[PDB]
Amino acid sequence: MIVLFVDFDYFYAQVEEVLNPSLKGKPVVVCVFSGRFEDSGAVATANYEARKFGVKAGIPIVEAKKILPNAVYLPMRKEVYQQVSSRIMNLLREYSEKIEIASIDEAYLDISDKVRDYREAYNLGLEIKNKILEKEKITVTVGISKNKVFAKIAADMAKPNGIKVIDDEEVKRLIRELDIADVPGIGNITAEKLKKLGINKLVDTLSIEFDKLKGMIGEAKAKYLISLARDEYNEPIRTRVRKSIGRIVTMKRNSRNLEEIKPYLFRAIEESYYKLDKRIPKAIHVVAVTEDLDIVSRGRTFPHGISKETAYSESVKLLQKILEEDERKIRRIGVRFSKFI
DNA sequence: GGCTACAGGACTC
DNA sequence: CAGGAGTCCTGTAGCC
Numbered sequence: 175m176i177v178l179f180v181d182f183d184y185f186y187a188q189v190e191e192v193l194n195p196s197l198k199g200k201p202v203v204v205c206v207f208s209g210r211f212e213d214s215g216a217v218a219t220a221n222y223e224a225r226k227f228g229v230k231a232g233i234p235i236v237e238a239k240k241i242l243p244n245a246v247y248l249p250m251r252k253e254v255y256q257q258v259s260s261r262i263m264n265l266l267r268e269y270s271e272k273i274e275i276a277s278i279d280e281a282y283l284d285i286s287d288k289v290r291d292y293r294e295a296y297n298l299g300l301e302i303k304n305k306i307l308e309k310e311k312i313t314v315t316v317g318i319s320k321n322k323v324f325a326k327i328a329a330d331m332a333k334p335n336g337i338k339v340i341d342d343e344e345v346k347r348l349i350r351e352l353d354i355a356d357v358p359g360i361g362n363i364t365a366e367k368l369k370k371l372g373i374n375k376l377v378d379t380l381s382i383e384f385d386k387l388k389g390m391i392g393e394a395k396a397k398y399l400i401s402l403a404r405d406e407y408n409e410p411i412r413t414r415v416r417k418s419i420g421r422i423v424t425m426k427r428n429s430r431n432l433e434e435i436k437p438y439l440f441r442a443i444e445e446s447y448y449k450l451d452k453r454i455p456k457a458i459h460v461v462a463v464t465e466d467l468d469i470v471s472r473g474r475t476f477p478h479g480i481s482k483e484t485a486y487s488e489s490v491k492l493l494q495k496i497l498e499e500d501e502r503k504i505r506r507i508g509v510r511f512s513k514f515i
Numbered sequence: 516g517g518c519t520a521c522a523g524g525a526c527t528c
Numbered sequence: 529c530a531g532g533a534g535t536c537c538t539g540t541a542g543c544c
């Protein structure tokens with residue numbers, strides 16, 4: 175088939191840039207301020223300007239400020255990027271109803287029944303970048319190919335404001351050369367493991383004994399990687415349905431005392447419940463990030479919908495359980511709701 | 516043996 | 529110096 179992957183550029187940063195065009199040209203850094211102290215927090219995203227100097231998502235805001243003391247540091251406004259993202263998705267629908275929105279930032283379009291070959295494809299790619307440019311003034315990178323993985327990779331390879339095609343020929347080219355750590359779903363941990371057995375390329379999974387690979391990375395990944403090696407990988411582009419909604423907050427200071435954690439936990443529930451909108455969850459999970467940045471959680475599934483009232487009460491137990499089954503101090507607390515009726 | 520819930524792990528954006 | 533949100537998978541144990 176033919177998948178055309180769409181990825182917005184420095185989305186959070188660019189959105190901010192669209193609303194305040196004077197930001198144009200400067201290093202913009204959208205961050206998540208934790209409130210613990212002047213500049214505590216991490217980076218959500220940074221435009222290419224901030225990026226070329228090492229400012230990337232996931233690092234502490236304090237770090238970013240050393241490298242770029244005079245960079246614009248804006249606080250995250252996710253609801254604005256969401257209203258903006260939504261508008262762009264609706265446009266993409268105008269190009270195919272077999273559309274998979276993977277995130278607030280990416281969309282997969284199965285254009286198997288629109289373009290005959292990769293040529294009208296590349297063309298439809300251009301037609302879309304322009305449409306989004308004339309509509310919302312947002313640059314996006316377009317990745318085209320036979321399956322979702324390579325379309326995404328195509329895009330990774332062309333950003334930003336790009337558009338690349340990866341024909342069947344290059345798919346074999348890449349299966350043999352592309353760095354396996356560069357394959358969607360392969361993080362450092364798995365990558366190490368992989369390139370711990372030569373595996374530095376997809377095809378290498380074709381040579382090794384299945385159980386050897388399956389014993390190291392699991393049945394799902396060994397198959398995922400193998401299916402890609404054989405150029406036999408297919409995953410339908412499907413309407414994605416949210417499976418869970420939650421909220422988590424950082425406490426002004428670590429602690430293990432229950433009365434000092436409830437306010438946070440309870441507010442997490444207020445917002446969570448807000449977002450559920452009209453969804454009724456049957457499972458609730460209390461998620462706690464320990465002082466050493468570990469993650470412990472306790473959940474519960476009910477045979478019925480959970481009222482905010484019940485969510486409140488049950489969360490206290492799960493938290494209790496957590497505390498009582500681990501002796502570390504919490505740093506963040508939150509709740510996640512799932513299994514919607 | 517395999518299906519369920521639950522808790523941990525890994526990854527991603 | 530370590531934010532926020534969400535998905536998929538695996539190991540363990542209860543159960544048929």
Ligand SMILES: Nc1nc(=O)n([C@@H]2CS[C@H](COP(=O)(O)OP(=O)(O)NP(=O)(O)O)O2)cc1F
Pocket residue numbers: 181182183184185186217218219220231232277278279333528
């Ligand atoms: N650690 C992260 N925290 C975040 O909040 N984000 C958010 C969630 S979606 C939005 C995507 O931003 P951007 O498009 O800049 O990230 P990419 O990885 O797509 N880089 P791009 O090539 O500029 O898109 O960034 C991403 C992250 F990677």
Ligand SMILES: [Ca+2]
Pocket residue numbers: 181279280528
């Ligand atoms: Ca992305």
Ligand SMILES: [Ca+2]
Pocket residue numbers: 181182183184185279
């Ligand atoms: Ca993006």
Ligand SMILES: [Ca+2]
Pocket residue numbers: 355356357360361362
């Ligand atoms: Ca990687």
